[PDB]
Amino acid sequence: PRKGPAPKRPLVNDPVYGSQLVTQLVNKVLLEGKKSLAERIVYGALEQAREKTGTDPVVTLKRALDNVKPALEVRSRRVGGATYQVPVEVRPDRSTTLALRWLVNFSRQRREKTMVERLANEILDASNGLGASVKRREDTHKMAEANRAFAHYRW
Amino acid sequence: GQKIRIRLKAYDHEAIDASARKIVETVTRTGASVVGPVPLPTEKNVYCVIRSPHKYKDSREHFEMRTHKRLIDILDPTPKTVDALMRIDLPASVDVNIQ
Amino acid sequence: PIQTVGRRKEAVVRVRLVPGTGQFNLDGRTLENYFPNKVHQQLIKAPLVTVDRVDQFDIYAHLDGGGPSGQAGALRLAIARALILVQPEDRPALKKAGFLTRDPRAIERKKYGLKKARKAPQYSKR
Amino acid sequence: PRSLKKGPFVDDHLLKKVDVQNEKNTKQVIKTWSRRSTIIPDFIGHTFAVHDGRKHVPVFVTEAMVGHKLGEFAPTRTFKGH
Amino acid sequence: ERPHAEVVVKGRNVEVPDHFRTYVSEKLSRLERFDKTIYLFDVELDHERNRRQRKNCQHVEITARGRGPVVRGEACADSFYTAFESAVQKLEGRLRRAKDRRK
Amino acid sequence: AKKSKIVKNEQRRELVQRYAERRAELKRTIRDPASSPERRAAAVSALQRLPRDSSPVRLRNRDVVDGRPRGHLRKFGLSRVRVREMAHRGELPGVRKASW
Amino acid sequence: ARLVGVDLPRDKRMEIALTYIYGIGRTRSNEILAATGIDKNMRTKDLTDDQVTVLRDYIEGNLKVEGDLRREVQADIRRKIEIGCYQGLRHRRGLPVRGQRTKTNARTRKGPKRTI
RNA sequence: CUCAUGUUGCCAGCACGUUAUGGUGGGGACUCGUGAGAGACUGCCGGGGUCAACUCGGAGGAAGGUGGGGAUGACGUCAAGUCAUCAUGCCCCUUAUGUCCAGGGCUUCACACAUGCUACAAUGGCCGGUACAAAGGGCUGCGAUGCCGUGAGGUGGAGCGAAUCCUUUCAAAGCCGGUCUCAGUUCGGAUCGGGGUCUGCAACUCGACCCCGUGAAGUCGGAGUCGCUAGUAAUCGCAGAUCAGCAACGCU
């Protein structure tokens, strides 16, 4: 990208509801091009959410996104014998990307015999304020609090 | 009625179309029923090769011997026309199956 | 008669678009018989969705070539072009979302020295 | 494995020589060049030897050596270790 | 990782009395002494066998692993000793470069 | 490759053209059915009396111009090197560099 | 429960439960099940002494077992190693015997990957 | 995209077979296979811009700012590689370093290096049921249906120099129903002991393949590194030059 960026892709919408955050999620769990498989996994987990909290699953998903979606994060740079971390504001695109990435990949290493359960109950956890996703988000904010001192480079 | 079918084979498209027009002409010379060279497929015998001796298997090249094919169905095979079309002259590049 | 075409990466479909209901018939079956894939159904529906005429225009298809998603894109394409034959006036509001273009993105030639299209062999330095 | 519709591979040289031998009724050490010949129980009397690329090896015969080739009883490669 | 220095000895066609091995293993421990980031050392003996040599009878290439960059040293001489010691010096040049470019 | 080796493959083709015509064929024909005299044929042991060269496994598609016993294309009937060279000189019908 | 020589598990469909005996695999297990006529959607906890006994009679009549099989292999190998076959010599060495790769791989017979 | 072009392939409009079905006449209408030409040329908009290029957002379009990928290696270096594809200057063999012969090897292994795949599982293992791609190969050969074999396999040959015929009217992921219910495990398949098939005169070093029993290491990987910017990567399978049959999981 020494010449300039390319436009970001014309994303699809959710076929059923109309929130493309859903297709963002299914594309980020998509694994070996099995989109309809990941999609029925998705619908099943979302229906678990609906039948387990009486709400529309997309709203509680937004809830969990609001919990774990950061604003400030890290950016490293090797400088002067001790490579420094630097605080950076993080725009909405990368924010959402990173939040969903944490959420998926920490649903992966759970212990529920099945992904439909690991995923869904992890969503419940991040929603109502308990999950390992929230844990790692707090870890990152604490790291930014740590390396506040080095913002002044302004990079 | 009756038919006689020609299946023309060649490698030059210019020349297969040339002899197609010529044969259709000579079929028309008797007022005999003529149809035309229907646009039917062509084989493609392809052969990859390596260029250099003794090594450099990553550098390669391709070659493609096509096979131009044309069907010509002559109706009204008046036996005068049949024995006339048995005796058309052509150059070497084309060959013909008369069946 | 009304007849238009749809082609997406070797996935050809012919179409009969009639002013009846939205009856779908696709080679001796329907959209709920074939296509257990809801994103594909969204693709198949998006032109009638656009014109808000869902269940205003019967469609009859003959599928051949390609796989389900290629056939799906070709289907929605042909349905939109048939809607243009029904009336072109809606066309320049369909380019506003561009549900009309042929997908100019086909599979690539496989190259020599390599493992497929662009995946190179591991440049090993031992 | 040798197919059964074809039967065995008992080759002419030693097959005919051992015909001659059992019709002499006498048994002695007898050399042959064929690793590829299959074994019959009619070889438990004679002693056969085969070449292995360097020289010849003799071998005495047993009941349960049937259905096999003679090369299975010649050492073709020597590896004593490093 | 001191006997972990993966010596690789090689010669395509040269008469090899067993002292080339001695010379080379010792001239490799020579530089093991002062660089601890090393896994493999390939060591090669090659010869042009041309009438009227152009003062290049024996030839040597050496190549060594490292954590990231690798090390590369080529030399050419009339016999074993000038070429081995020359390549050793060129290795030291590459290695001194790399260890000055470490901190 | 070598004159002697091309000569020997040529000899072997002559042998095969002679004897696999019918002599090394009838035994196969009679010994494929399970009505065969195998139980007392000695036709297997008789095919051991024919020369080993009777069998075609000893043949090899060598080029006509060089004798390269490898890299041989039956359609052109040639070593890949000579194939390259001919198509380079433009000396084969309708053959060219293509893409797709 | 107890059988000809292996302690059966509990929560194993019969086709899989019999597979823990040496001379029994999945194909022979299901073949025996088809011969007996019992539903292969069952558990070992719910099995009957009658059925077990007749099964036991059947297999000891028509199928060699653990001990006879180990005995058989021992006999085969002492036989082909006393007549000095090439298989026998490779078994003496401990190297792959069926005409396989030997130089690099076959650690399954060469032991662990012990460095030299 | 306009016109033609009608079978060995489509088959909408029509009439006829009905167990397998475009299967047959009938329409070249849509597809279409094969060829010719228009279409992108910053073509025109208006604000920027030595007013020049160079751009910025537009219309229209199937594509729009070198549509995409291909073919294509400026002069030369690395005395790059091949005197064993081939050609050849010089030196040598000649009673032999030539040459005809069967056997053996190039597959030896206490190890090292490199390339890849098959795995460490529930997105997964197993049976059964349902639909579709592109694509090529073929004659002293590709081989269909029937039946028999567990299954590789089989007498036999219909039809085929082949848009037909062998190529199931061409597939695997996937979908529907149910079980397995997270563990050295219905994961994984090594490895061996035996029962066997085909071709080849000949399956021991040494061939591929089915079946029985076999059930090992492996519980996500170290310092660093490798490849990838779109129909790409990651995954499923197909087809084939060479080839009698094979290590082909390579290569295309």
From Swiss-Prot, chain A:
Q: Does the keyword tRNA-binding apply?
A: yes
What would you give as a GO molecular function for this chain, any one?
Answer: tRNA binding
The UniProt keyword set, sorted, is: Ribonucleoprotein, Ribosomal protein, RNA-binding, rRNA-binding, tRNA-binding
Q: Does the keyword 4Fe-4S apply?
A: no
Q: Which Gene3D superfamilies match?
A: Ribosomal protein S7 domain
Q: What is this protein called?
A: Small ribosomal subunit protein uS7
Q: What this chain does, per the record?
A: One of the primary rRNA binding proteins, it binds directly to 16S rRNA where it nucleates assembly of the head domain of the 30S subunit. Is located at the subunit interface close to the decoding center, probably blocks exit of the E-site tRNA.
Q: What is the lineage of its organism?
A: Bacteria, Bacillati, Actinomycetota, Actinomycetes, Mycobacteriales
From Swiss-Prot, chain D:
The protein, known as = Small ribosomal subunit protein uS19
Instruction: List the PANTHER family hit by this protein, alphabetically.
Output: RIBOSOMAL PROTEIN S19P FAMILY MEMBER, SMALL RIBOSOMAL SUBUNIT PROTEIN US19M
Enumerate the Gene3D superfamilies for this protein. 30s Ribosomal Protein S19, Chain A
Entry keyword annotation includes RNA-binding: yes
Per the UniProt record, the source organism is Mycolicibacterium smegmatis (strain ATCC 700084 / mc(2)155) (Mycobacterium smegmatis)
Give the similarity note. Answer: Belongs to the universal ribosomal protein uS19 family.
UniProt keywords (A-Z) are: Ribonucleoprotein, Ribosomal protein, RNA-binding, rRNA-binding
Its GO biological process terms? ribosomal small subunit assembly; translation
User: Is the Ribosomal protein keyword given for this protein?
Assistant: yes
Instruction: Give one Pfam family, short name only.
Output: Ribosomal_S19
Q: Which GO terms describe its cellular component?
A: cytoplasm; small ribosomal subunit
MF (Gene Ontology): rRNA binding; structural constituent of ribosome
The role this protein plays is:
Protein S19 forms a complex with S13 that binds strongly to the 16S ribosomal RNA.
UniProtKB/Swiss-Prot annotation, chain F:
Q: Which GO terms describe its molecular function?
A: rRNA binding; structural constituent of ribosome
One Pfam entry for this protein is Ribosomal_S14
Which InterPro entries does the record associate with it? Ribosomal_uS14, Ribosomal_uS14_bac/plastid
- Report the leader peptide range: none
Write out the GO biological process terms: translation
Keywords in alphabetical order, please: Ribonucleoprotein, Ribosomal protein, RNA-binding, rRNA-binding
Q: Does the keyword Cytoplasm apply?
A: no
CC per GO annotation: small ribosomal subunit
Functional note? Binds 16S rRNA, required for the assembly of 30S particles and may also be responsible for determining the conformation of the 16S rRNA at the A site.
* PANTHER family in the cross-refs: 30S RIBOSOMAL PROTEIN S14, SMALL RIBOSOMAL SUBUNIT PROTEIN US14A
> What is stated as this protein's family in its record?
Belongs to the universal ribosomal protein uS14 family.
Record text on subunit structure and interactions: Part of the 30S ribosomal subunit. Contacts proteins S3 and S10.
Q: What is this protein called?
A: Small ribosomal subunit protein uS14A
> Which organism does this record belong to?
Mycolicibacterium smegmatis (strain ATCC 700084 / mc(2)155) (Mycobacterium smegmatis)
Q: The organism's lineage?
A: Bacteria, Bacillati, Actinomycetota, Actinomycetes, Mycobacteriales
Curated annotation (Swiss-Prot), chain G:
Q: Which GO terms describe its cellular component?
A: cytosol; small ribosomal subunit
Q: Where is the signal peptide?
A: none
Biological process annotations from GO: translation
Q: Where is this region: Disordered?
A: 94-116
UniProt feature coiled coil, ranges: none
> What does the record give as the function of this protein?
Located at the top of the head of the 30S subunit, it contacts several helices of the 16S rRNA. In the 70S ribosome it contacts the 23S rRNA (bridge B1a) and protein L5 of the 50S subunit (bridge B1b), connecting the 2 subunits; these bridges are implicated in subunit movement. Contacts the tRNAs in the A and P-sites.
Question: Quaternary structure?
Answer: Part of the 30S ribosomal subunit. Forms a loose heterodimer with protein S19. Forms two bridges to the 50S subunit in the 70S ribosome.
Question: What is the name listed in the Swiss-Prot or TrEMBL entry for this protein?
Answer: Small ribosomal subunit protein uS13
Q: Which organism is it from?
A: Mycolicibacterium smegmatis (strain ATCC 700084 / mc(2)155) (Mycobacterium smegmatis)
